Every structure is written in C-alpha cells, then in structure tokens.
Amino acid sequence: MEELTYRLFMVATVGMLAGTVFLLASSREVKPEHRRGVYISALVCGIAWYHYQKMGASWESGSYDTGLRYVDWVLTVPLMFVEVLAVTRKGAAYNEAVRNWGIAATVMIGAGYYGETSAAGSNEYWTGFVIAMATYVWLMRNLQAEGEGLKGDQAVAFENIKNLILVGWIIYPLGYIAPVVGDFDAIREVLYTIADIINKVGLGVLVLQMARVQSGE
Ligand SMILES: *C/C=C(C)/C=C/C=C(C)/C=C/C1=C(C)CCCC1(C)C
C-alpha cells in the first residue's frame, strides 16, 4: 500500500500538469467569450500540480503532511464553484452564490482538517466529519437546484457538470473514513488522489465541453 500510494502521487502530479496544459492548448477551440471557465479550470489543475509535487515528496519522506492536501482544497474548491455558477448566474445572483458557497466550502474543508488531524475515531475526528458532512450536503442540495430551468444542449452539458460533482465528490468522505474501516491510512490518501484527478481534470474537460456548446458547436 505505501508504494502504491507513492506511485499514485507521482502519476497524479504529471496528470495535473497534463490537465493544466491540455486545457490551455484547448482554449483556442472555443470562442473567446467562453474561454474564462477553461482558463480557471487550467488554474485549478495548475495549483493542484504545485501541491501534488509537494505531497509526493512529503509521502515519500515517511512524515506526510495532509495540510498540503487541505490547503490545495481550500484554494481550488471556490474556483470550481466560480466556474459552475457562471453558467447559471451573473451580477447579483452570481456574487451571492459564489460568496455563500465559498464560505460553506471553507467551513467544510476546515472542519475536515480539524477532524483528520485529531486522533482517528475520537470525538474530535467525528465532530469534524459531521460538520463537514452537513456543509457538504448543503452545498450538494444547492448544486442540484442550480440550472433546473435550462433546456437543450446547454442543459445536458450543465447536468454533466453537476453529476460529476454530485457523484465524484462522494469519494472524499469515503477516504476520510477509510482509516476507521481497516488498517487503511494509506487508502485514505489513495482515494483523495484518485478523487482529485477525476474531479479536477474531469471538471475541466466538462467545462471545455460546456464552452464548445456555448460557442455553438
Ligand atoms: C479539488 C478538490 C476537491 C473538489 C475537494 C473536495 C473535498 C471535499 C468535498 C471534502 C469533503 C469532506 C467531507 C464531506 C467529510 C470529511 C471531511 C472532508 C473535508 C474530506
């Protein structure tokens, strides 16, 4: 398990870089007015690339720092919401949701960090899990309600974005609890890594697809 976890960190590092530069190279495929989300998706993968290089080194040392993962999350999750909410909102409605969902994400990630750095299975560990889970469910319920009025190819492309988040983000609470299900500390890190690749590279691909649709392709 320890070597598998290291290898996955190394592969994910190159994968985040590939996502970054793939998305940048692909921006010419859509109209200028629809490139912003693609560029933000590239920024998300680029920040992740930076932190994945650090996480692989940290894991390899034998004294791993989950703070690297959590700082990456706290910076990137609000950016992902910026991309999502721009599809359905502008102006006042956009500003309100970006702020409120960003605050919620920060609470979720901070509660998780508090719990994960507590003794596994302790009241503190479960306190962080429960607070994070409630905030997560609030976010997912808000997301489900977004764009329910859309029709046509834009509706389908937005539903694909929503579904990636609604399904893919379940991996994170599963990773968080893995170490109390078995001798699975490394499996937490495996699951977080797989999740970050799926969610960050996948969202970028789907934001690019949305931009193709918005461009009339
Ligand atoms: C790019 C990274 C992403 C999208 C990270 C997402 C992280 C989460 C949705 C984390 C959620 C958690 C819970 C719902 C409960 C346990 C604590 C967390 C922070 C792992």
Domains of the chain: 3-216 (1.20.1070.10)
Q: Is 150 helix (H, G, I), strand (E, B) or coil?
A: coil
CB-based contact 143:158 (threshold 8 Å):
no
Q: How far apart are CA 65 and CA 56, in angstroms?
A: 10
- Closest atom of ligand 1 to 177 CA is 16
Q: Is 117 helix (H, G, I), strand (E, B) or coil?
A: coil
Q: For residue 98, give both structure tokens.
A: 């970006």
Residue 45 carries which DSSP code? H
Give the burial string for 1-33 (b: 16+ CB within 10 Å, else e). eeeebbebbbebbebbbebbebbbebbeebeee
Centre a 10 Å sphere on the Cβ of residue 67 and count the other Cβ atoms it contains: 15
The whole-angstrom distance between residue 198's C-alpha and the CA centroid of its chain comes to 9
DSSP string over 118-177: SPTTSHHHHHHHHHHHHHHHHHHHHHHHTTTT--HHHHHHHHHHHHHHHHHTTHHHHHHH
Q: How far apart are CA 17 and CA 23, in angstroms?
A: 10
Helix (H) / strand (E) element for 9: namely: helix 2-26
Q: Which technique?
A: X-ray
Resolution in A: 1.1
Residue nearest to atom 12 of ligand 1 (CA): 173
Does residue 129 have its Cβ closer than 6 Å to ligand 1? Answer: yes
